[PDB]
Design a protein around this ligand. Structure first.
Ligand SMILES: Nc1ncnc2c1ncn2[C@@H]1O[C@H](COP(=O)(O)O)[C@@H](OP(=O)(O)O)[C@H]1O
Ligand SMILES: [Mg+2]
Ligand SMILES: [Mg+2]
Length: 358
């Protein structure tokens, strides 16, 4: 009952990954309330050309204008499940497409993609099959939970600075000027709901989207979306090389799955200011490591992910929303499976199960 993760096992040709299409969206407001619309979407608004360059003081507003989301509340798939409930009769494909699909969060798939190269943080994924559909929901590991409650001040401030960068680069209205005098409230989120397919595995997943570029060439989502990122300033080829090997892998995996074509990075100096920007097209990120003996390979990422979905599908035989197959993985080891029922691992809520049953 095990799945190996070594990169050399997955080194063949790039598998088929269907162009993702956006089926819908939803927003979570400042009170973490769900709305089935795009009210939370912000608009890409980078520093005006022929004006002063970026000069963003991410160290502005922390912590008195910071309203961090309560991470103790474990929402699991609940918001995505509400979207599915409100769109189940109106999904594309045809009869029984949902019954053949795997439903999860984009970030869960990102963790699968990076697993062959990940050497720091393990994970756990709870799986339940219900009306044919395979649902995947991450479980916080004991080490992750302990790390979270013991987050050092530096890490808490670094997390704020990543969200603060968005406030310098986005506006509430197209063409608007970004307003950093306000609050960073990380309850607020705009999520895109996407359909794709990896190999023979249809996928339905949602992902948080940083902003929309109204000047983007392609007007149809997800091609108009932009991912915003921060990273430390780099000054030597060796620093850039380490960035290419480790960070860009994570950025690629996150933006490749939903079809977000550009990541815009602000580089922060040690005093907390962003004074330079650079755009990384998702489809060109691998070029930085293609001829690197210590690089990553997107074919390995996707072939492993396909192998895991096959492994999970074959492992979860029983159609039962109270039954959970927990997939556990630590760096260097295989993915292992354990079986559980009801609390605490069961994650499909009665309100979803009963509505789908009726
Ligand atoms: N797994 C994680 N652990 C701790 N902080 C995280 C995190 N994922 C995201 N963050 C914070 O959320 C911000 C927005 O995420 P995202 O870039 O994916 O849109 C991140 O900014 P950065 O990505 O610039 O570090 C980071 O500050
Ligand atoms: Mg984001
Ligand atoms: Mg971002």
């Amino acid at each position: 009952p095990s799945l190996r993760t070594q990169p050399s096992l997955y080194s063949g040709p790039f598998p088929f990954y269907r162009r993702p299409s956006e089926l819908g969206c939803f927003s979570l407001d400042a009170q973490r309330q769900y709305h089935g619309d795009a009210r939370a979407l912000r608009y890409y608004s980078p520093p005006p050309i022929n004006g002063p360059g970026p000069d963003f003081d991410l160290r502005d507003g922390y912590p008195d204008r910071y309203q961090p989301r309560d991470e103790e509340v474990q929402e699991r798939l609940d918001h995505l499940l509400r979207w599915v409930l409100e769109h189940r009769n109106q999904l594309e494909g045809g009869p029984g497409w949902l019954a053949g699909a795997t439903v999860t969060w984009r970030g869960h798939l990102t963790k699968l993609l990076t697993t062959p190269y990940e050497r720091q943080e393990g994970w756990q994924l709870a799986a339940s099959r219900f009306q044919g559909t395979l649902y995947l929901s991450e479980v916080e590991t004991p080490a992750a939970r302990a790390q979270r409650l013991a987050r050092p001040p530096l890490l808490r401030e670094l997390m704020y600075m990543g969200y603060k960068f968005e406030q310098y680069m986005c506006a509430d209205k197209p063409g608007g000027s970004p307003d950093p005098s306000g609050e960073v409230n990380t309850n607020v989120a705009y999520c895109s709901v996407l359909r794709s397919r990896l190999g023979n595995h249809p996928l339905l997943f949602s992902g948080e989207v940083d902003c929309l570029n109204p000047q983007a060439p392609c007007t149809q989502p997800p091609s108009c979306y932009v991912e915003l990122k921060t990273s430390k300033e780099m000054h030597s080829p060796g620093q850039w090389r380490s960035f290419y090997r480790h960070k860009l892998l994570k950025w690629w995996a996150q933006s490749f799955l939903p079809g977000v074509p550009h990541v815009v990075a602000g580089f922060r100096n040690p005093e907390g200011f962003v004074c330079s920007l650079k755009t990384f097209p998702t489809m060109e990120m691998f070029e930085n490591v293609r001829n690197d003996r210590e690089g990553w390979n997107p074919s390995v990422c996707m072939n492993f992910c396909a192998a895991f979905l096959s492994f999970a599908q074959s492992t979860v035989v029983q159609d039962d929303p109270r039954l959970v197959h927990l997939f556990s993985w630590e760096p260097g080891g295989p993915v292992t499976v354990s079986v559980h029922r009801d609390a605490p691992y069961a994650f499909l809520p009665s309100w979803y199960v009963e509505t789908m049953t009726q």
